[PDB]
């Protein structure tokens, strides 16, 4: 745009770290999650990474190494069909389930699963998972929100709630769970439980049903197709916890074709570049083209 960059501008320009350029990692936050007290030596600080894509919920227990971050365990809302949930796969309730799943999943693999049940009950009341006496302290993890905004009622703290209720020690506070009243400075646990089991989606389903068969029919095309009536959402989620606590272990997809087969096709849609000689030829040609005034 005649806003051209002088070769001097480019030459002195210092680039941000790669992941900064690409808008993914906040480094000020990362320094503070990751850095360990120097006299706890190689004790890993462990983050509960929670991200949302437009269609999936990612949940990862990650730690740090100069040579790269290291995942202990991972869970994804896309897993949830295995345990009964087939819709609203990025809603709060799934965030809760996914946080539960990751919790039971890692501390299964940690040995820690029987000692440290979690809550099992679930009325969504504020409580941290507190340590047994004369036994192992709970496995402790710190929420990594990434770049997400801390809003009071955010999905991300759903994953926190599931994972805390899962038996992980994840330090937190009530004031961002839905149901926190800023005037009251209290948390109505009624509301928070409702979210855990999807109440907010369920009530909407009913209102819409009664007030707009048509729009209800698009937004809930799926539920219609599966004969899922609305006031059975709670069962779906309640029964989903059962399932998840019953069997948190990771089963990987069944996998048509091998990493090799994938490789030989899957980006031999990849443009292959020229050798310094082909380039020369192109150069010499282009001139013969361009030479002769106009």
């Amino acid at each position: 745009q005649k806003d051209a960059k002088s070769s001097a501008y480019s030459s002195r320009f210092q680039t941000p770290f790669r992941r900064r350029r690409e808008g993914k990692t906040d480094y000020y936050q990362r320094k503070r999650l990751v850095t360990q007290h120097k006299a706890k030596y190689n004790t890993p600080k462990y983050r509960l990474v929670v991200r949302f894509t437009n269609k999936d919920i990612i949940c990862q227990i990650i730690s740090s190494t100069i040579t790269g971050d290291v995942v202990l365990a991972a869970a994804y809302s896309h897993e949830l069909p295995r345990y009964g949930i087939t819709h609203g796969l990025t809603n709060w309730a799934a965030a809760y389930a996914t946080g539960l799943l990751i919790a039971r999943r890692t501390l299964q693999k940690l040995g820690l699963d029987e000692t440290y049940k979690g809550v099992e009950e679930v009325e969504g009341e504020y409580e941290l998972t507190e340590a047994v006496e004369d036994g192992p302290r709970p496995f402790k993890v710190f929420l990594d929100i990434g770049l997400q905004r801390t809003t009071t009622g955010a999905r991300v703290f759903g994953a926190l709630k599931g994972a805390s209720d899962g038996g992980l020690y994840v330090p937190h506070s009530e004031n961002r769970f839905p149901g926190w009243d800023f005037e009251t400075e209290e948390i109505d646990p009624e509301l928070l439980r409702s979210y855990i089991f999807g109440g907010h989606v369920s009530q909407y389903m009913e209102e819409l049903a009664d007030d707009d068969e048509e729009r209800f029919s698009e937004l809930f095309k799926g539920y219609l197709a599966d004969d899922i009536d609305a006031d059975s959402l709670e069962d779906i989620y309640t029964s989903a916890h059962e399932a998840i606590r019953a069997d948190p272990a990771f089963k990987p997809t069944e996998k048509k074709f091998t990493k090799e087969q994938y490789a030989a096709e899957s980006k031999k849609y990849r443009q292959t570049k020229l050798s310094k000689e082909e380039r020369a030829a192109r150069v010499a040609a282009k001139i013969a083209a361009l030479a002769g005034q106009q």
Binding site: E22, G23, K24, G146, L147, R149
Partner: protein, 169 residues
């Protein structure tokens, strides 16, 4: 080619550069409230300038930002006032465009002599779908070269609906 990427109003920004603080500015703001149906925002002077009679941090002007179908209706009203004719200036190099009217009663709007008469700037910014890319928190990016609004493209858009006249060069 052309499927998605249609072209549209991002927003309409009505601005009344009032020039002073107090009743007159609160009066003008009422015009924007009673018109946008939103509540307008007030600008403070960046610096003192004796000969204009304004002190730094004194509230001089009000504006209000409008979007979607309502902004499109207010735009139309304005165009009416200028008899569907704008000038080939008017349109920015980067695809937006604007105009101003004197006396706001020229677009609906009774008279209520406790309000009075105000002229106003009209600025309408054009984008496409996918602007979010440059506006969102995570993975903020830049819109591609093709894609992205231009004076040519948006002048022609504007001639073509609105059935209007650009003018001069």
């Amino acid at each position: 080619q052309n499927p998605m990427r249609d072209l549209k109003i991002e927003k309409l920004v009505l601005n009344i550069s009032v020039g002073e603080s107090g009743d007159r500015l609160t009066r003008a703001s009422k015009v924007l409230e009673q018109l946008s149906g939103q509540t307008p925002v007030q600008s403070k002077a960046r610096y003192t300038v004796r000969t204009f009679g304004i002190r730094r941090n004194e509230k001089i002007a009000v504006h209000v930002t409008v979007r979607g179908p309502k902004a499109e209706e207010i735009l139309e009203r304005g165009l009416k006032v200028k008899e569907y004719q704008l000038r080939d200036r008017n349109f920015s190099a980067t695809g937006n465009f604007g105009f101003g009217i004197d006396e706001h009663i020229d677009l609906g709007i009774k008279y209520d002599p406790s309000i009075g008469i105000f002229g106003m700037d009209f600025y309408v910014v054009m984008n496409r779908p996918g602007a979010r890319v440059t506006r969102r928190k995570r993975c903020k990016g830049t819109v591609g070269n093709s894609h992205k609004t231009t004076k040519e493209d948006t002048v022609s858009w504007f001639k073509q609906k609105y059935d209007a006249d650009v003018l001069d060069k």
